[PDB]
Design an enzyme around this catalytic site. Structure first.
Site, short mmCIF file in Angstrom:
data_model
loop_
_atom_site.label_atom_id
_atom_site.label_comp_id
_atom_site.label_asym_id
_atom_site.label_seq_id
_atom_site.Cartn_x
_atom_site.Cartn_y
_atom_site.Cartn_z
CG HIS A 88 54.84 42.67 31.50
ND1 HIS A 88 53.53 41.97 31.85
CD2 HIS A 88 55.44 42.18 32.43
CE1 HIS A 88 53.65 41.42 33.29
NE2 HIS A 88 54.81 41.52 33.20
CG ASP A 91 46.33 47.51 22.58
OD1 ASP A 91 45.98 48.98 22.15
OD2 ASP A 91 45.79 46.51 22.11
CG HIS A 93 41.89 50.66 23.33
ND1 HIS A 93 40.68 50.26 23.93
CD2 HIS A 93 42.67 49.51 23.33
CE1 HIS A 93 40.72 49.03 24.18
NE2 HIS A 93 41.93 48.54 23.75
CG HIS A 128 44.59 46.49 27.10
ND1 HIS A 128 45.15 45.24 26.73
CD2 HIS A 128 43.74 46.83 26.42
CE1 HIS A 128 44.64 45.20 25.31
NE2 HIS A 128 43.69 46.05 25.25
CB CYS A 129 49.67 44.56 29.66
SG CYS A 129 51.14 43.05 29.35
CG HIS A 138 49.71 39.56 30.74
ND1 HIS A 138 50.69 40.07 31.26
CD2 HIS A 138 50.08 38.36 30.54
CE1 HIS A 138 51.87 39.21 31.28
NE2 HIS A 138 51.09 38.26 30.99
CG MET A 143 49.08 44.06 33.85
SD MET A 143 50.47 43.36 33.04
CE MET A 143 51.59 45.18 32.91
CG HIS A 248 22.85 54.35 39.54
ND1 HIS A 248 21.89 54.71 38.93
CD2 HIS A 248 22.71 54.49 40.87
CE1 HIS A 248 20.86 55.18 39.72
NE2 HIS A 248 21.49 54.86 41.10
CD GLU A 272 17.09 55.15 35.04
OE1 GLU A 272 16.81 54.69 36.28
OE2 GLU A 272 16.42 54.94 33.92
CB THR A 273 22.00 53.21 34.76
OG1 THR A 273 21.55 53.22 36.09
CG2 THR A 273 22.86 51.80 34.68
CG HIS A 299 21.73 49.86 39.21
ND1 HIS A 299 20.83 49.10 39.14
CD2 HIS A 299 21.62 50.90 39.95
CE1 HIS A 299 19.74 49.46 40.17
NE2 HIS A 299 20.25 50.36 40.49
CU LIG Z 1 51.41 42.28 31.00
CU LIG Z 2 42.39 46.42 23.70
CU LIG Z 3 19.09 51.87 41.78
#
Ligand SMILES: [Cu+2]
Ligand SMILES: [Cu+2]
Ligand SMILES: [Cu+2]
Ligand SMILES: [Cu+2]
Ligand SMILES: [Cu+2]
Ligand SMILES: [Cu+2]
Ligand SMILES: [Zn+2]
Ligand SMILES: [Zn+2]
Ligand SMILES: [Zn+2]
Ligand SMILES: [Zn+2]
Ligand SMILES: [Zn+2]
Ligand SMILES: [Zn+2]
Lengths: 335, 335, 335
Positions: A88, A91, A93, A128-129, A138, A143, A248, A272-273, A299
């Site tokens: 493993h 990463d 971001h 994330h891995c 992964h 992950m 939502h 709303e969303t 939603h």
């Molecule tokens: Cu992994």
């Molecule tokens: Cu990424």
């Molecule tokens: Cu709705």
């Protein structure tokens, strides 16, 4: 220079909670130290006993949320115990260089590594891995999680006025790709490795078998519903490391939302969303005005109700008839 | 009046490069003249020899990027040689009227036409073929690219401060729908027309067989990786004429991003992942701070790693330990 | 206090029209009264006679658009006649509390109810049916529409300058999931209830059989094309209660667009294509500059041309050669 700064150590907590932290702070930059331990395990992901050969940071889907402030340095020790079967890494971001840190944190079972990076950009960011040649597997097996980098002076509205939350919840949404056999039943695999080929075939259809919050259908319902009170502002962090979703709150709104998750940008109001791009985390604030049980969901209502992407928030307080009133209850049509 | 303006002639270049141009300019409006020639051809789109019966502007997927300034007029001669089998046209999303110009540029094999339109709106805009009754097939088979209309005074940040790029790259992402036969192998067609019905059946599933940058799995890797240096700002133009995507630079960010691609709107900063709506082009600036090989990809990681939507950027320069440092390399867990 | 305000009664009109209303108004808050009656019915949704066992507010897909101003109270009487077979309710995304009103408007066939809520947030908001345990089916079968809450002083641009429309159209886009039998033909069901199980199986694939504007393939074409004139500004309200879409006007633009649909946020300008998140309504303004027949469509071109998500707008007026000119009509290539 990071070598000269004070260090602090943070104890992580399990989702959907987020570890104690300050928003606006008078504190200067620090090297903030975290540790996470990878756990591969089989998990039951629905009400009918379907299992996933899962992979996690710290035993949960999502991994825990790590919180620092802009200008801080994150220093993570990543541990891959010998009880695991696969290599493993991680990463971030939120980080700059070396494929988010992945190139510097390759850990085989029985190994660990420590990465430092400068959290020089505010926002919620996916981590994330990403092991070479096995990245999608992964990630979709569990992950991922969120790094939240708060501005040193707290959140701000489009006019630069202060915003805050009184409590924070973290929701990770996981598109799962569980294979079926000739009988149409989901397959159960004895090991992680044996799940791989069949899973990749399902992945390539781009159709999830399940889409769950926090590791399982109904994870954030019943005894595990989120909670708040009228007058409380909640921050809802939503991560989706692989696939788009559209959060939502039923009976509510996103009062202030950073759907791309980056706090130096003005938030939008009254949503709303909203939209979380696959490969990102976003953040919404909402101040409760009515008591009752709300649903927080994706939603695409099929994805929510059929495939699992929905939770509940149970809210205490006094009903407000100005905001909403049943004028005439259900009764026979006249005459 | 456009008839009275000076004319200029631009020579187009093949993606992922973009033809020489000024950003901020002291020049006044011009009629800028371009020519493109349509080429239908079979292309190999993956590492196992799968072919696509493709259709292109100027022999490439995507077509070349055309660059003008706001207030300029674009004057395109579109040529459809007699060696082609199908009629074609062009629809510029940057243009006003006549279905983007499509109604005025219907060219059968052996014909050509010249369209002029005023580029009165800044941004990156998709152009694509759109022949009546065959629009999706022409688009998904490769007939799209970008028109970039720069503001006359260059790009601007949300506070009106100048922004710039030192080099520009154009990436077209193509969702492909290659049919399979009873044996489960991809079909190879002797002619474009013979591919049509089977392709439409795959299209209607909404599941691409492949999703590629610039015409092929791995097009922007190895010898064809994009390049930059630490301290250089790159503009990454991303077009997707048919389907949504979510660009991300691994180990980097979108420093300033116009995800809807329209430069009169303020950009967002610090993005991890942005969103290109199907039927649009967007633009991100990033200034490199670390050397190494980055991946630029669609962050549906299945779409990227399994289906092909990923490239590389090889970056020269000096590593910066303040931004990221391996504190402890992978080593056995204590004790 | 809402009990002390003047009441007004609005007569709804069928899509794609929107009932008469003011934009900026000198009027103070009111309790605005509406009524809608649910109708379940079988509808023909394509050119080959495919039927849907549909459910509607007021007999149409979408339901009619309800228009009020910020600070008003919406007071809806919802009627479920005894000729219907299923229970229904209504969830207003524009409302606060009780699952959008759904908990307070549960009406079995032969019943009606009256809900009031305060429209305290400006924007276009989805309303939809949401009966416990049957939410996706009711929504995808047609039970959604838009509530537009206008700011009391009208729409505003990012600098606070006035914006307006001269006419408004409402488009609801419906992802449909029609089952097929062993012969590959679409199934026709004698009753709504009999369609349920087979439909849910199609829904869970996440692949619509059809995606239509306003209830049918071609609903907004031919005699039913939308209309405007050069110099007129149109508002295009686009609702999608279940699934993302990406509206585009071919040969035009979104001059000012609120893609998340919330008018207190600045609009974006010059869009080629915008994005409506599943579970929301958005709004675009466009001022026509060229006459002719435009297409308004979802720019996943497969979804538009193959599955049905496309309409037409027929525009009268004088052609403008400065904006676009055919310099050389299609003719043989030299020499
Ligand atoms: Cu992994
Ligand atoms: Cu990424
Ligand atoms: Cu709705
Ligand atoms: Cu063509
Ligand atoms: Cu187009
Ligand atoms: Cu209903
Ligand atoms: Zn130190
Ligand atoms: Zn508070
Ligand atoms: Zn001239
Ligand atoms: Zn530079
Ligand atoms: Zn009253
Ligand atoms: Zn007007």
């Amino acid at each position: 220079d990071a070598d000269k700064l004070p260090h602090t150590k943070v104890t992580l907590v399990a989702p959907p909670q987020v570890h104690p932290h300050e928003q606006a702070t008078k504190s200067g930059p620090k090297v903030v130290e975290f540790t996470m331990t990878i756990e591969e395990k089989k998990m039951v992901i629905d009400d009918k006993g379907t299992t996933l050969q899962a992979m996690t940071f710290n035993g949960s889907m999502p991994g825990p949320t790590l919180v620092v402030h802009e200008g801080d340095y994150v220093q993570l020790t990543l541990v891959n115990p010998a009880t695991n079967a696969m290599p493993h890494n991680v990463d971030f971001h939120g980080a700059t260089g070396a494929l988010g840190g992945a190139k510097l944190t390759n850990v085989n079972p029985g190994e660990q590594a420590t990465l430092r990076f400068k959290a020089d950009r505010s926002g919620t960011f996916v981590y994330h891995c990403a092991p070479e040649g096995m990245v999608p597997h992964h990630v979709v097996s569990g992950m991922s999680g969120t790094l939240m980098v708060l501005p040193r002076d707290g959140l701000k509205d489009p006019q630069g006025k202060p915003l805050h939350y009184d409590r924070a919840y973290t929701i990770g949404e996981f598109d799962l790709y569980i294979p079926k056999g000739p009988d149409g039943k989901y397959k159960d695999y004895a090991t992680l490795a044996e799940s791989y080929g069949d899973t990749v075939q399902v992945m390539r259809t781009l159709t999830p078998s399940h889409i769950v919050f926090n590791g399982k259908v109904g994870a954030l319902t019943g005894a595990n519903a989120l909670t708040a009170k009228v007058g409380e502002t909640v921050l809802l962090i939503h991560s989706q490391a692989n696939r788009d979703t559209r959060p939502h709150l039923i009976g509510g709104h996103g009062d202030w939302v950073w759907e791309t998750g980056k706090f130096a940008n003005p938030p939008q109001r009254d949503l709303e969303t909203w939209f979380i791009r696959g490969g990102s985390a976003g953040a919404a604030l909402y101040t409760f005005k009515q008591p009752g049980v709300y649903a927080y969901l994706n939603h695409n209502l099929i994805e929510a109700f059929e495939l699992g992407a929905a939770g509940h928030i149970k809210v205490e307080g006094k009903w407000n008839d100005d905001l909403m009133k049943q004028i005439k209850a259900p009764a026979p049509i006249p005459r």
